[PDB]
Structure 1
Amino acid sequence: TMDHLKHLQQLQNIERIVLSGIVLANHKIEEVHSVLEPSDFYYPPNGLFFEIALKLHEEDCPIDENFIRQKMPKDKQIKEEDLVAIFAASPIDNIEAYVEEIKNASIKRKLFGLANTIREQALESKSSDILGAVEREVYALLNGSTIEGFRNIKEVLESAMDLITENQRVTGIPTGFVQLDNYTSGFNKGSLVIIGARPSMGKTSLMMNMVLSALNDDRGVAVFSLEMSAEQLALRALSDLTSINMHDLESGRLDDDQWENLAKCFDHLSQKKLFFYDKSYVRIEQIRLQLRKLKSQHKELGIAFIDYLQLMQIAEISRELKTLARELEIPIIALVQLNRSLENRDDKRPILSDIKGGIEQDADIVLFLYRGYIYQMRAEDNKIDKLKKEEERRIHKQNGSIEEAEIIVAKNRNGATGTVYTRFNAPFTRYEDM
């Protein structure tokens, strides 16, 4: 019921297609030639056709029925049935895969030839010689494939320079804090960045502002909330846009002037490139897969965020995440909730090693949230307890509810290590820039 080579006549069609696509798009010939060669073709008229195409492109001459019929080599003549059939073919875009597949077919051809060859070669024997022949054939095929190969650096260097000079004519994605961007130099692509903060310090609120920092830069963001639901996460961001306190927004009552700015920021964010996934306690591979999926769906995606990571090993999580960071070529930011052993210490300032099956290392940039007032309060309480054994808030509210906060830049790979002071607003749970 099955006849070999039936697929092959179909395989010819692909060649026809690709050629037609290049007919319509002359520039495509380069990206074709970079992979396929005239000998790589099964059907000869197609291969020689390709040869002619190359000879024409090198002299910067367009490719068409007129240009093709005239520049005939007069050594071999394309059959009329085929000649017309090529141009008659329906034009198709995204032919890159077709090129790859024709390369597959040619590869298969090299396979059938070599496979038969080596056997007969081995038949005669010096079997060691046959082994060496196998090795040489192996190297030949290996070089032939060019799948996940090496070379070459010098080419990509020029483009990497032409990209930075174009912006020189910001290096990465804007953070939101100018203080921080002096050290970070913006969010560079494929860079794994992590923020470890204690609960209720305003971690969840702080993240959203940096999200907005990317949104005004029109860069696609994928958001991952495991523990929390999406709705609230949106609510904080609106709390930061409309400049309205959290409670009034949460309860429901809004006057004439606030619902207006609310609705004004509403569609503003609605049109912004924003995606959500509120499903609880997702696995790392599922993350990799879904990110592959969304990046496949949307090219525009330039950054990713996750809130937040749970303690169970952290090293492999950070590793696969760095892997995906360089894979999708975008900087990934995840939130971590540090261990309680941080507060047992006298100086309650967060340090790199506080989140202890091993300690996390893979992160390129690590940021800590520290509120100078919250730990001052406990020391004052301790001193009071010490005095028994031996109003300030309302003033704070009347000032404008501004407290001193520090964003520790403890880790910066091949950069600077420092601390930046930022004013924190308690009711809006927002970090003011200055």
Structure 2
Amino acid sequence: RIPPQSIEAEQAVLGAVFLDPAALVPASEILIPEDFYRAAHQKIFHAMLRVADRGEPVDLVTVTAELAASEQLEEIGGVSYLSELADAVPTAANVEYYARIVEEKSVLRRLIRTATSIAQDGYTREDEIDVLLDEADRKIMEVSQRKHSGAFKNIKDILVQTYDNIEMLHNRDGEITGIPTGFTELDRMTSGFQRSDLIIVAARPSVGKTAFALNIAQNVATKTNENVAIFSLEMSAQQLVMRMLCAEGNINAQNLRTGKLTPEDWGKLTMAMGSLSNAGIYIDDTPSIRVSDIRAKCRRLKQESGLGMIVIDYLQLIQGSGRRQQEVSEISRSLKALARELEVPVIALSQLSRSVEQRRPMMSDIRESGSIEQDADIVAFLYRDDYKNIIEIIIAKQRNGPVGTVQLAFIKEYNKFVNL
């Protein structure tokens, strides 16, 4: 001994049902009474199910009545005991997780039971053997096919979601409820980037995720009265201002890189600086910050000058709480908490795995780097069709609003994204 069990989880399942009758549906889906290790819990779950099958409300009173009529009340500890179960549940909404724990421990008991049974038969019947091996095969497989799996989503139901998506993509009108992006076509879908949202922009190297984020940050700060906080972990503050000066005044980048500057390309530079000086752009070019540092700096900024957006130049460079799989999840989770705290959209750039080439990016390409998928309420991919200087912005996830591809044009010479 002792047989795999979780009295605590069993207690929380039954408790949940007593706090919210709706908790019984998820529990009955995952468990049958016999999954409970403790006899009293079996009797109790069975009483609940019976009451439920009659279409009668399942609560402390009807379960008490049910058990009294089947002469099982005292045996399971009485009304007092039903009370304790009600106090043993940390949160009724977590009932599936408690249920799964109970189920897991039931499956293990069946594994142990059938394995032992096979071992015993080995010493006894001795005898047949060929039948023994076959039923040993048979019995072990039966343990797995027990857990609550499924279900398959039916094509009809997806077609509905698919069509309703196409509805939203055309029903697209037209107010910008969040922070305008400057890319009117991206604003149609998003509306635009909204407060408290975690926005993830993933793209393979050379695609232009950095330029994309800077263009957005640049449009917000120069066009709207809002402040943008940019964290550049791979690129210095001057190296990044160089790129948004070019983008601003239409100055050939390579031209600046080589000193060459036509007399009027210079006049072009002074107007860029003039207009860019009025913008509320705050840059932190610290090589590998932790999320706490990011958070603290943004915190001080919002209450010192006000804050509208946070842009982080790629997330895989943020160092964890210590000195990578689990580590990235916490950062992801932390960035979402950052968004909620400061009531601001957080744009975190992400790099994609080399899977896109093994096939147009999809969720599974960041799923091997997850679980950013869960935390992000909006995940965007950048894909160039020709690797036409046109680039695609695939919105793969959006919690409130449609899913589709917005299209923009990229100008290499100025490192810009323009409308279409």
Cα distance in 2 between the residues matched to 1:304 and 1:181: 15
Consecutive unaligned residues of structure 2, counting only runs of 5 or more, are 173-179, 193-198, 221-229, 249-269, 283-300, 340-344, 395-403
> Could you say if the C-alpha distance between residues 299 and 212 of structure 1 is closer, same or farther in structure 2, counting changes exceeding 3 Å?
farther
Aligned amino acid, residue 42 of structure 2: G
Residue in 2 that maps onto 1:32: 27
2:85 equivalent to 1:85: no
Aligned amino acid, residue 433 of structure 1: N
Cα distance in 2 between the residues matched to 1:159 and 1:58: 31
> Could you say if the C-alpha distance between residues 48 and 164 of structure 1 is closer, same or farther in structure 2, counting changes exceeding 3 Å?
farther
Cα distance in 1 between the residues matched to 2:69 and 2:114: 32
2:32 equivalent to 1:22: no
After TM superposition, the structure 1 stretch with the greater mean CA deviation from structure 2, 315-324 or 39-48, is: 315-324
The alignment's TM-score, normalised by the length of structure 2, stands at 0.56
Q: How does 1:152-163 map to 2 (within 5 A)?
A: 152-154=152-154, 158=157, 161-162=160-161
The SS at the match of 2:56 is coil
Measured against aligned partners, the alpha-carbon deviations of 1:207-236 in whole angstroms (never above 9, x if no partner) come to 33457999xxxxxxxx99653258976998
Choose from 314, 325, 329 the match for 1:292: 329
Aligned amino acid, residue 92 of structure 1: P
Residue in 1 that maps onto 2:225: none
Aligned amino acid, residue 419 of structure 2: D
Aligned amino acid, residue 116 of structure 1: T
> Could you say if the C-alpha distance between residues 113 and 232 of structure 1 is closer, same or farther in structure 2, counting changes exceeding 3 Å?
same
Aligned amino acid, residue 119 of structure 1: A
Aligned amino acid, residue 111 of structure 1: L
Consecutive unaligned residues of structure 1, counting only runs of 5 or more, are 215-222, 335-363, 370-405
The SS at the match of 1:68 is helix
Choose from 64, 74, 82 the match for 2:69: 74
Cα distance in 2 between the residues matched to 1:235 and 1:25: 59
2:169 equivalent to 1:170: yes
Residue in 1 that maps onto 2:262: none
Measured against aligned partners, the alpha-carbon deviations of 1:137-187 in whole angstroms (never above 9, x if no partner) come to 1221121235xx564232x86267348627837399x997567999xxx9x
- Deviation of 1:299 after TM superposition, in Å, equals 6.4
| 8 Å CA contact retained: 1:225, 1:280 | no
- Deviation of 1:29 after TM superposition, in Å, equals 1.1
| 8 Å CA contact retained: 2:217, 2:311 | no
> Could you say if the C-alpha distance between residues 323 and 307 of structure 1 is closer, same or farther in structure 2, counting changes exceeding 3 Å?
closer
Choose from 345, 353, 368 the match for 1:324: 368
> Could you say if the C-alpha distance between residues 164 and 15 of structure 1 is closer, same or farther in structure 2, counting changes exceeding 3 Å?
farther
The SS at the match of 1:77 is coil
Aligned amino acid, residue 45 of structure 2: F
Q: How does 1:88-237 map to 2 (within 5 A)?
A: 88-89=84-85, 90=87, 91-93=89-91, 94-123=94-123, 124=125, 125-146=127-148, 151-154=151-154, 158=157, 161-162=160-161, 165=164, 168=167, 170=169, 177=183, 194=204, 196-197=206-207, 204-209=210-215, 227-228=234-235
Cα distance in 2 between the residues matched to 1:104 and 1:306: 38
- Deviation of 1:33 after TM superposition, in Å, equals 1.2
The SS at the match of 2:31 is coil
Structure whose alpha-carbon radius of gyration is higher: 1
Measured against aligned partners, the alpha-carbon deviations of 1:322-366 in whole angstroms (never above 9, x if no partner) come to 5437965478668xxxxxxxxxxxxxxxxxxxxxxxxxxxxx943
Measured against aligned partners, the alpha-carbon deviations of 1:95-143 in whole angstroms (never above 9, x if no partner) come to 3332221112212221232122112223313222111112211221121
> Could you say if the C-alpha distance between residues 31 and 70 of structure 1 is closer, same or farther in structure 2, counting changes exceeding 3 Å?
same
Aligned amino acid, residue 214 of structure 2: M
| 8 Å CA contact retained: 1:422, 1:431 | yes
| 8 Å CA contact retained: 1:38, 1:48 | yes
Residue in 1 that maps onto 2:419: 433
The alignment's TM-score, normalised by the length of structure 1, stands at 0.54
Measured against aligned partners, the alpha-carbon deviations of 1:59-118 in whole angstroms (never above 9, x if no partner) come to 443322222222337334122635412323424212333222111221222123212211
> Could you say if the C-alpha distance between residues 271 and 197 of structure 1 is closer, same or farther in structure 2, counting changes exceeding 3 Å?
closer
Residue in 2 that maps onto 1:217: none
Aligned amino acid, residue 407 of structure 1: N
Cα distance in 1 between the residues matched to 2:47 and 2:231: 53
> Could you say if the C-alpha distance between residues 44 and 166 of structure 1 is closer, same or farther in structure 2, counting changes exceeding 3 Å?
farther
Q: Root-mean-square deviation (CA), in Å?
A: 5.9
Cα distance in 1 between the residues matched to 2:219 and 2:109: 53
Cα distance in 2 between the residues matched to 1:72 and 1:30: 20
Cα distance in 2 between the residues matched to 1:418 and 1:6: 56
Q: How does 1:275-354 map to 2 (within 5 A)?
A: 288-297=325-334, 306=349, 321-324=365-368, 328-329=372-373
Cα distance in 1 between the residues matched to 2:162 and 2:409: 33
| 8 Å CA contact retained: 2:17, 2:23 | yes
Measured against aligned partners, the alpha-carbon deviations of 1:274-315 in whole angstroms (never above 9, x if no partner) come to 6676785989xxx6544422444566899975477999x996
> Could you say if the C-alpha distance between residues 409 and 433 of structure 1 is closer, same or farther in structure 2, counting changes exceeding 3 Å?
closer
Aligned residues between the structures: 330
